[PDB]
């Protein structure tokens with residue numbers, strides 16, 4: 724029944740380049756059978772969370788899905804933007820995990836416990852990987 | 853101290869005339885000590901929001917102030933255009949007000965809690 728999630732450690736990938744982006748470490752510790760691993764650590768970027776939230780909104784129960792932190796850049800500093808984003812991503816996952824139809828989602832499990840890309844998850848869930 | 857802002861009740865002013873326009877009720881309630889009124893209700897039109905943002909962005913320097921909804925009528929109907937505008941205007945104010953960055957801006961206060969026109973605000977703050 725314990726599922727503890729943390730979002731930490733923003734890092735810049737491909738820094739300086741056309742395709743630079745920030746990603747976040749996601750730690751999960753759980754004794755839940757929802758998950759193949761008791762402990763996992765993966766990195767995900769904001770756009771993958773956007774993909775995730777939309778996938779969760781296809782849930783079979785039509786249950787509402789917690790909000791993500793937004794795209795607003797209205798911050799004195801980039802550090803503040805990233806920290807508020809990090810907090811908001813962690814809060815999002817905490818709340819997702821409290822909803823049984825969302826917690827049990829097979830694509831959530833692939834998001835949290837693998838580093839399959841979004842297209843790779845999409846291929847996996849069609850048996851095309 | 854929280855600031856609650858709502859943009860509601862779009863209405864057509866001067867309906868059927870050359871100078872017809874839509875405006876919006878801006879309702880604010882706050883326990884923030886800086887505001888002159890705990891609850892205010894003013895009406896503002898889109899062009900006034902455009903004026904406001906320009907003033908706010910000058911104050912912010914290179915910090916990017918929240919975007920306004922645009923002019924392009926990409927929604928299918930006037931009703932949908934106005935409702936999405938209203939939502940966008942509320943979102944703009946929510947983001948503006950939820951940060952400490954612009955809360956000292958004289959123009960913002962007069963926009964929100966007076967029914968001074970834009971020229972009158974400009975005159976007020978210029979002396």
Ligand SMILES: [Cl-]
Pocket residue numbers: none
């Ligand atoms: Cl971007």
Ligand SMILES: [Cl-]
Pocket residue numbers: 846847849850851852
């Ligand atoms: Cl497969």
Ligand SMILES: [Cl-]
Pocket residue numbers: 864865866867
């Ligand atoms: Cl009228």
Ligand code: NA
Pocket residue numbers: 761
């Ligand atoms: Na084990």
Ligand code: NA
Pocket residue numbers: 860861862
């Ligand atoms: Na209305």
